């Protein structure tokens, strides 16, 4: 992998969340009133948060859409993008078991270390687990 540029580009300058909000910072802001459901896995001493929202066609078991939030490093945004693209239009299995190692290799080279800003893997797992529970199969989840 190579620079998108990962961070400090373009006319935001880091990430696209910063561009989106409005209000900035402002430290008076809240996310209200409903939440977007699925899995939340935001770490507040690592300064990074990811929240992936799946939509799933029940009948085929195919992920219709999956969107992400990335807070933290801007490197992580590209990896999140690529997995969410890949997973869409594909099997139930594709959306599960998502790594982790893959994110590290894809961005440039793999340090064989989990950054802690590469939360996308845990986020997707939470979402599919929640989904499986609510449709009444938590006994083959584990």
């Amino acid at each position: 992998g190579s620079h998108m540029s990962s961070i400090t580009k373009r006319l935001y300058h880091p990430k696209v969340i910063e561009h989106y909000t409005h209000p900035r910072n402002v430290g008076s802001l809240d996310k209200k009133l409903p939440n977007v459901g699925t899995g939340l896995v935001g770490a507040p001493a690592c300064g990074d948060v990811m929240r992936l929202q799946i939509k799933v066609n029940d009948s085929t078991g195919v992920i219709e859409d999956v969107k992400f939030k990335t807070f933290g490093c801007g490197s992580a945004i590209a990896s999140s993008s690529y997995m969410t693209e890949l997973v869409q239009g594909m099997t139930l299995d594709d959306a599960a078991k998502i790594k982790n190692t893959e994110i590290a290799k894809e961005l440039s080279l793999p340090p064989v270390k989990l950054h802690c800003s590469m939360l996308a893997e845990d986020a997707i797992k939470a979402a599919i687990k929640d989904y499986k529970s609510k449709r009444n199969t938590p006994t083959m989840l584990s």
Binding site: G39, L40, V41, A43, P44, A45, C46, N100, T101, A104, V112, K113, L114, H115, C116, L119, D122, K125, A126, K129, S142
Partner: protein, 121 residues
């Protein structure tokens, strides 16, 4: 976040979700099992005398009920069992934990219940 990496490392604040059972290797399971056995044995009611681990041999001297040693069965049909009234059972992996395919259920839970049930009365 680093050391000794890569599935192991977490910042211990991403753990608001269930963590992976993990492998690396099949031996991992044996180690975990051995530890569970040690814990259960201790706080003796004088029905469990010992837990032993020799040199590749694991013997489990269980309370005066549900006798059987636990060794890992030679290739396929894993893990020995031999209940006194319900006879042999055997286990294969189903979610990173050995599960009976006579009745289902995790191996971890069976051990928990059966030792502490003796400790009571």
């Amino acid at each position: 976040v680093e050391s000794s990496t890569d599935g192991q490392v977490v910042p211990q604040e991403v753990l608001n979700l269930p963590l992976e059972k993990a492998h690396e290797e099949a031996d991992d399971y044996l180690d975990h099992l051995l530890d569970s056995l040690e814990e259960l044995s201790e706080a003796h009611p004088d029905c469990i005398p010992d837990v032993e681990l020799s040199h590749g041999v694991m013997t489990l001297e269980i309370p005066a009920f549900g006798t059987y040693v636990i060794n890992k069965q030679p290739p396929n049909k894993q893990i020995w069992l031999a209940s006194p009234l319900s006879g042999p059972n055997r286990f294969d992996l189903l979610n990173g934990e050995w599960v009976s395919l006579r009745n289902g259920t995790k191996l971890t839970d069976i051990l928990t219940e059966e030792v502490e049930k003796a400790i009571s009365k």
